[PDB]
């Protein structure tokens, strides 16, 4: 079925920028909202951003509003999280997930394995 | 009859944004297309007639374009007061004058996951033949959410109704109630009552449950 693969993470200085990619294989994802989540070690997983279907917009967590931007490359079956103005508090494993519900209720059935982001 | 197809159903945008609402006629209506605004609990208000003529008294941030079959209403700078339903209307073919099905325009905010609460039926209600089990999803954004009822781990279908509040004017969130209605007899056959909630702000569904009589 679908496999999700995150990339683009790594070590970055405070104030720096990274672009995460979430590439989907096995199934076309242009009909589904794609979300970004993050989890620091031993903390709760938290929502970061969602890119709904092209034309339906994007929504953001308060912690990243004005700094991170979600976008889609539907032809390459991929979505992105552009992360500017990175802060120590942003360090975490970052995950992408498909919302399997086309009406956007947040049925997150498929997840990537994650990619580490370290700001320091 | 000319059918009017209006899109999107729910337009979520930020103050200052340029927004557009579309209205496609099923056959040509020339420039005989009107646009109305309806605030919650208010009367329709004419914004645009003849496809692009701005009605007197309506702010200049409202404009309409189009001819024939394809029309758009643009708010070039969304303001707080523009939260409302919007309707297109053709008058070329009469009878009947027809309307689009409506667009709700709302002001976007950051994501807030619902807080969930489950409430069992009261002894008082049960004495009388019916059991109402209530699940509350409180203070969340965006509006889309899914509630699933499970009774002794069996998923329920067809015996629930939902009601949603209007977007809160202070904090821009929604709340939602899902009520599961059973006969008292059916309610008393089971032990565990669970309300399972999904929202795009939740990484895993949130389940609240009670054990009957405990």
């Amino acid at each position: 079925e679908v496999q999700l693969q995150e990339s683009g993470g790594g070590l970055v200085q405070p104030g720096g920028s990274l672009r995460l990619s979430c590439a989907a294989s096995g199934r076309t994802i242009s009909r589904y909202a794609m979300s970004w989540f993050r989890q620091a070690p031993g903390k709760e997983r938290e929502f970061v951003a969602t890119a709904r279907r092209s034309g339906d917009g994007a929504f953001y967590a308060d912690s990243v509003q004005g700094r991170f931007t979600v976008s889609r490359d539907d032809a390459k079956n991929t979505v992105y999280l552009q992360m500017n103005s990175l802060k120590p508090e942003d360090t975490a494993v970052y995950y992408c997930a498909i919302d399997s519900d086309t009406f956007y209720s947040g049925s997150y059935d498929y997840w990537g394995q994650g990619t580490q982001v370290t700001v320091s | 009859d000319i059918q009017m197809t209006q899109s999107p159903i729910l337009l979520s945008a930020s103050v200052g944004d340029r927004v557009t609402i579309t209205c496609r006629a099923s056959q040509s209506i020339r420039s005989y297309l009107n646009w109305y605004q309806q605030r919650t609990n208010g009367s329709p208000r004419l914004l645009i007639y003849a496809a692009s003529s701005l009605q007197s008294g309506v702010p200049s941030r409202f404009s309409g374009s189009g001819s024939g079959t394809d029309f758009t209403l643009t708010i070039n700078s969304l303001q707080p007061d523009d939260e409302a339903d919007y309707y297109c209307q053709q008058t070329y073919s009469n009878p009947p004058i027809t309307f689009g099905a409506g667009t709700r325009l709302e002001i976007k905010r950051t994501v807030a996951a619902p807080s969930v609460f489950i409430f069992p039926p009261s002894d008082e209600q049960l004495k009388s033949g019916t059991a109402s089990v209530v699940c509350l999803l409180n203070n969340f954004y965006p509006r889309e959410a899914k509630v699933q009822w499970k009774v002794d781990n069996a998923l329920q279908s067809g015996n629930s109704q939902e009601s949603v509040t209007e977007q809160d004017s202070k904090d821009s969130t929604y709340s939602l109630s899902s009520t599961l209605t059973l006969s008292k007899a059916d309610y008393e056959k089971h032990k565990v009552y669970a309300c399972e909630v999904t929202h795009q702000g939740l990484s895993s569904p949130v389940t609240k449950s009670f054990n009957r009589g405990e």
Binding site: - | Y36, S43, N94, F117, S132, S163, V164, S177
Partner: protein, 219 residues
């Protein structure tokens, strides 16, 4: 100022009749086309009927043709809608609206003036007050009251005789399959307040003179 006001809405049994009026002021009513438009609970606008200045042109939506009759009396600046054989799908708020066009007024065909509307409810239900049931209760608890099986709208719910307003959500009613309405009213309060403070919901249903207080206490 230009003004329209609808009157004549109310409860009606299916199959029965009702007459709506629309009183106009602030413009020359005799010169303009007038319209009836309706909006079912939670639904969009639906055009019903129109009538030209001199009553020579009349149109009807197919769903009402043969049951509804539009008319006007220009001497009394009034528009009318006689509704017969009412069905449950005629339940709606009925608006009268002024056309921009009419006698000597050509080329603009928006509906520029609207009334506040008059509510029509087609139902077999009898008038009945709600039953009121407690919705019993991190650092935040929720408690409430279920307000069930009342007819017609509205009910009002207050908490602690109006002293408690922050964090209250009184949901919009739902029409149940039985033909009766229900809603819940909930409130979020400190979980620490559950042992020390008293929460009472005060339900008022004026059509039936029902007043019910319900103490909402932990189980």
């Amino acid at each position: 100022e230009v003004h329209l006001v609808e009157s004549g809405g109310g409860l009606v049994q299916p199959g029965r009749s009702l007459r709506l009026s629309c009183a106009a002021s602030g413009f020359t009513f005799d010169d303009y086309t007038m319209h009836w438009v309706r909006q079912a609970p939670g639904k969009g606008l639906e055009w019903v009927s129109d009538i030209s200045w001199n009553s020579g042109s009349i149109g009807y939506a197919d769903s009402v043709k043969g049951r509804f009759t539009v008319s006007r009396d220009n001497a009394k600046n009034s528009l009318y809608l006689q509704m017969n054989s009412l069905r449950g799908e005629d339940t709606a708020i009925y608006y009268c609206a002024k056309d921009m066009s009419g006698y000597g007024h050509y080329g603009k065909y928006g509906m520029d003036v609207w009334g506040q509307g008059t509510t029509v409810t087609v139902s077999s239900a009898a008038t009945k007050g709600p039953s009121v049931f407690p919705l019993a209760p991190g650092g935040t608890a929720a408690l409430g009251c279920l307000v069930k099986d009342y007819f017609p709208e509205p009910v009002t719910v207050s908490w602690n005789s109006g002293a408690l307003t922050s964090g209250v959500h009184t949901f919009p009613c739902v029409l149940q399959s039985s033909g009766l309405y229900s809603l819940s009213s909930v409130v979020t309060v400190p979980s620490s307040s559950l042992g020390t403070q008293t929460y009472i919901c005060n339900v008022n249903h004026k059509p039936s003179n029902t007043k019910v207080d319900k103490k909402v206490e932990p189980a």
